[PDB]
Design a protein around this ligand. Structure first.
Ligand SMILES: Cc1ncc(COP(=O)(O)O)c(CN[C@@H](CO)C(=O)O)c1O
Ligand SMILES: Cc1ncc(COP(=O)(O)O)c(CN[C@@H](CO)C(=O)O)c1O
Ligand SMILES: O=P(O)(O)OCCNS(=O)(=O)c1ccc(OC(F)(F)F)cc1
Ligand SMILES: O=P(O)(O)OCCNS(=O)(=O)c1ccc(OC(F)(F)F)cc1
Ligand code: NA
Ligand code: NA
Lengths: 393, 257, 393, 257
């Protein structure tokens, strides 16, 4: 039994070893009480504002839409401390950890952005932070690994399995199944067993809340659609949440299409995968016909979670949100275009959302539409990647 | 079915059960079939068999490598079921339980998975990442196909859980020795609630551990990593592997008497 | 003749070839009119807020001052779009350029931060941007050179002289002396010939203005001292300006001490140089006994301007502001300390200001003092530098 | 003093002045002294001499390298003044003007710099980065030491500037041929305001340019980069350098007659 519903339609649940259920029930209870505690909310708001930099700007593009009837705004999570939206919810989760009397933090990371956010929050709030990262990822993310260590976090390479995000995810749960008494597992996306999909959404929902206030102030109406990339689903559900009951507002999630859906080398399980049960939840996943779990391929390291949050699978199933995919090349073109026309360097993850907004505009240039793209992070971290690619071409 | 008969027999001989675990196909089909035949010949009262899976998040390093080795060999679930049918054709009475991860069971349909278990002669299925809270469709399909659904009684449990594990489980109650992954008074409450005989597992690697479990009132003990370690340590020595396995098993089984 | 005073006491002036005087007079006039134009001010404010992310946070450290009577706040220019304070004034200068009918931008850069800010502002506002950078700097700042190019700016290596910032400065003026009719020279610090020291201060003064509002709101009083690093003087004068008439508020500028003042390998001309005339101004400079201009040495690439803004030399001379120096090792320790205790990675430039605040605290731990350090930029760009150093030790 | 005498003489011979520029010490002390003696022998009516400086922001690439070469040779301002005293001891009447950057003049004191100029026999000083607007202490010190302060009359000027350049300057008025760095009706207004004779400079590299300047009413023409290019092109040929220099100068000087 739980206080909140662990399911979004058929998706979600708590598919974890029996030994970990007490930790999830404790976490759910701590979260429900925290959400009703004005003192917790004030502390969280103070950190978001005075430490992280909220509210973030809502920037109107003034060049990229020229010649069309599209008005495009970018929600600037790239300006948040840390360089991505990840920082929002780690601050909330770190405070939850302290409310439960926990002194240690376990986090998993693939690209390293959530790892860096976890480490910075842990350094600020006095938590001993250990991060699990697939060895393949540690190898290609030396910068973030060093940032995490400069911030005092213990970084632990995982060589098991494919030595990537999913294996890091497994290791974090293995650790937690033995240390939950003193450690909190700070999962980095809106996925995993309940209560995480819910907690992560609620601790990222200020993205959509601010966006709504900002667009009403600037345009006097709601957007026609809000667009966000989907790796695990946190930045997208954070943007979507406050608009779910505004039926006129389209919610568009963009999964990575990698080299193209037909090549099988992509990371789009919501629309091209098959429902399975893994990482504590029932959700669409990248899996072999036998049921073995596979990796998500994308030029962007952050759209690597091989499944997707259950609320997205649910919103898709009922037709409230639509999901699409963008290829490596389309994301690369959007990255180049924003740098050159707006002077903003977007994360390659976010570039997938921008690429789809560009397609909506370009495909029907005389369609009047007000769009908001969630710019989930900055792309300084992707400069070398983009450089070598273009140089190779 | 086979578990009940085994426990009744063991009770008559005032002995506990010794149940070894190994990963199917580790380190290969043929050698795995031989390892399994050796375990049985050495005294194993029942078997716990893992189907290789990509993400065994309830297993320590030793068994994680067991899975890796099996994958290196190309072992698939379909092939595991062929191995299972053959093991049953060779040994008609030994209880055989599978250690599964939820996705392999849900993949082609839960009901279909348990039906295949029945077809090949499997006796029980423990799905490691399915807590009692999410167990309904699994335990229902298990019962429809005369398969015992195995539940985990963690050490950090309570009465509510105890009553559920007792009413939902069959075959044996998996009594966890501790928290963490693979590498007392509960027993009485279980008997109080007419639960399936308790089998203690996790960290069991010595004969005295087996004697202590049976003395505490457990129907027996399960041991896996200790068994898998003998395999990994003798990879280059197929024969010595069987011999050492034979030695450990007989010792462990002896402790149960 | 000019509209405004080109001098701060004996320092400043317009020491440029006769051919460039018309450009400076035009620029001064455009600036004076812009400062009185509500439409210009509204446009500048809009860009600062909705594009750059102003206001930036004022963060109270909650760990670094433990055990002492120092309360330390960090003004978060590291959260400004671009990653440093440089962005503020390039937006103003880019708008001035357009007001004058100019379509091209010339900028000089050493570390590349001002170069990146110039390129992003130029991309947003439709200006053709060419940046001059000493070849030695281009070599060690491949990342920023690539960002500038991704943003459409032409980057031009300067091999003359020492092939560093001063030579880049000369080249920018040589170019401008022949293209002023169509191009604006977007100088990056509060130095050079009038009107630049004045324009740069006025376009960076929101740092101090916001800081004053924020500290009054949070502490109900003004700081005992505001502290900032000084390369050329822009981030420091931006923080200082609004407090100049608050006589109780100490103004502390920190020049780089490099390997130590006594080694001669430093960048502290204000306190250890000699007044000279170069780069269009009369000011303290790094120079040989013969009068040849030398480079400033610092572990931080941005504290490389071999002179200092004239208003700082003036504020020092009258005793209104005090200047000190911090060595490479003290800056490195402050960098490590903020990462670990506050989860903020500071630019190595800014780390010089933080190091001096740490010294004020540590030297007299029972002195009650309210301090603000201007965190001029983030230090993601310095991670490799710090890494190799520590690894070498 | 020497400029007045030279212009009076040239006026009597209805000829314009040809004034070459070179960097002192380029490419070395000795060779520079020889280059200078060659320029004089070839027809130079006066000399414009640069003191090597670290940041010559008013010079194009050709002269930037002239400075680099001199620095490669270790040439210092003190050594330039020793060269200047010797050149004057050898040539008593040729006007010698220095091309300076403000810091070298301000370094050890403005008054002291012009006093040293007088001591060695220099006739004028042009400080490239000191506009009329900042010229007061420089022109005052120049006059106190009988040195002509040279002012720049840019092409993009006006009456106000013209009147200032005319009242402040001495020796010759430097008439800029264009905007940019080293690589008509103004002349009349200058005469109107009794300005020092105008000498056109910047981009002068051919004989016809010299003839055109004198025809426009200029007292003569200055040429530097074209001269410095002959030096750089014959670095390995010391003698050929002098010969080519001798050739260019005589041609340019001939155009002035
Ligand atoms: C800037 C940015 N935008 C988007 C995403 C995708 O995740 P989301 O779908 O949870 O929002 C990530 C994820 N990053 C994860 C997974 O690798 C991490 O461990 O850092 C990101 O770093
Ligand atoms: C983060 C940060 N903090 C401080 C400074 C020092 O300059 P300031 O004294 O003008 O503020 C710089 C300068 N950067 C100059 C000089 O190299 C540039 O061309 O990028 C900086 O980049
Ligand atoms: O001797 P050890 O420590 O290796 O333990 C034996 C391991 N093999 S097993 O099938 O019992 C087994 C059974 C259930 C498991 O996970 C769960 F508890 F979460 F359900 C993990 C392993
Ligand atoms: O023939 P060129 O084009 O090389 O011109 C000759 C250059 N040597 S010079 O002493 O006249 C000379 C004089 C003044 C200069 O700068 C200033 F105009 F700003 F003051 C630069 C060079
Ligand atoms: Na995904
Ligand atoms: Na300086």
């Amino acid at each position: 039994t739980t206080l909140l519903n662990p399911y979004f339609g058929e998706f979600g649940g708590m598919y974890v070893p029996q030994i970990l259920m007490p930790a999830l029930n404790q976490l759910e209870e701590a979260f429900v009480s925290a959400q009703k505690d004005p003192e917790f909310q004030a502390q969280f708001a103070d950190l978001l504002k005075n430490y992280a930099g909220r509210p973030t700007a809502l920037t109107k593009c003034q060049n990229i839409t020229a010649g069309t009837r599209t008005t495009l705004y970018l929600k600037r999570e790239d300006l948040l401390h840390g360089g991505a939206h990840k920082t929002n919810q780690v601050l909330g989760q770190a405070l939850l950890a302290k409310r439960m009397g926990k002194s240690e933090i376990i986090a998993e990371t693939g690209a390293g952005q959530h790892g860096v956010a976890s480490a910075l929050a842990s350094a600020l709030l006095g938590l001993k932070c250990r991060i699990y990262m697939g060895a393949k990822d540690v190898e290609r993310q030396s910068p973030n690994v060093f940032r995490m260590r400069l911030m005092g976090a213990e970084v632990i390479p995982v060589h098991s399995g494919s030595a990537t995000l999913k294996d890091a995810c497994n290791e974090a749960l293995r650790d937690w199944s033995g240390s939950y008494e003193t450690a909190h597992y700070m999962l980095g996306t809106a996925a995993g067993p309940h209560p995480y999909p819910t907690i992560v959404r609620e601790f990222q929902r200020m993205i959509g809340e601010e966006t709504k206030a900002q667009i009403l102030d600037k345009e006097g109406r709601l957007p026609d659609a809000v667009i966000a990339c989907v790796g695990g689903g946190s930045n997208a559900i954070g943007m979507f949440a406050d608009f779910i009951n505004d039926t006129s507002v389209g919610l568009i999630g963009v999964e990575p299409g990698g080299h193209g859906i037909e090549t099988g080398e992509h990371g789009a399980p919501l629309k091209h995968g098959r429902v399975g049960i893994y990482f504590g939840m029932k959700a669409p996943m990248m899996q072999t016909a036998d049921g073995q779990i596979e990796e998500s391929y994308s030029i962007s390291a952050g759209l690597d979670f091989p499944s997707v949050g259950p609320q997205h699978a649910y919103l898709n199933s009922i037709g409230r949100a639509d999901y699409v995919s963008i290829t490596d090349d389309e994301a690369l073109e959007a990255f180049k275009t924003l740098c050159r026309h707006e002077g903003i360097i977007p994360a390659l993850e976010s570039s997938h959302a921008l690429a789809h907004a560009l397609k909506m505009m370009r495909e029907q240039p005389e369609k009047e539409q007000l769009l908001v793209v969630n710019l989930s992070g900055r792309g300084d971290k992707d400069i070398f990647t983009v450089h070598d690619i273009l140089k190779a071409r | 079915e086979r578990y009940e008969n085994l426990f009744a027999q063991l009770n008559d001989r005032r002995e506990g059960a010794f149940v070894p675990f190994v990963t199917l196909g580790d380190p290969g089909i043929e050698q795995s079939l031989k390892i399994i035949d050796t375990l049985i010949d050495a005294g194993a009262d029942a078997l716990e068999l893992g189907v290789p899976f990509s993400d065994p998040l309830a297993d320590g390093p030793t068994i994680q490598n067991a899975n890796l080795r099996a994958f290196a060999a190309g072992v698939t679930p379909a092939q595991c079921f062929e191995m299972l049918a053959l093991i049953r054709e060779k040994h008609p009475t030994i209880p055989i339980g599978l250690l599964m991860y939820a996705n392999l069971v849900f993949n082609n349909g839960i009901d279909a998975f348990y039906a295949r278990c029945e077809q090949v002669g499997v006796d029980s299925v423990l799905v490691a990442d399915v807590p009692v809270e999410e167990s309904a469709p699994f335990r229902q399909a298990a019962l429809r196909h005369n398969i015992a659904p195995i539940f985990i009684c963690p050490p950090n449990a309570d009465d509510d859980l105890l009553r559920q594990v007792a009413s939902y489980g069959r075959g044996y109650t998996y009594l966890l020795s501790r928290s963490g992954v693979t590498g007392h008074h509960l027993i009485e409450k279980l008997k109080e609630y007419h639960a399936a005989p308790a089998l203690q597992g996790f960290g069991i690697s010595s004969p005295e551990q087996v004697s202590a479990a049976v003395r505490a009132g457990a129907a027996g003990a399960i041991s896996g990593s200790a068994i898998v370690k003998i395999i990994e340590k003798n990879l280059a020595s197929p024969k010595q592997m069987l011999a050492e396995l034979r030695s450990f098993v007989s010792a462990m089984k002896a402790a149960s008497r």
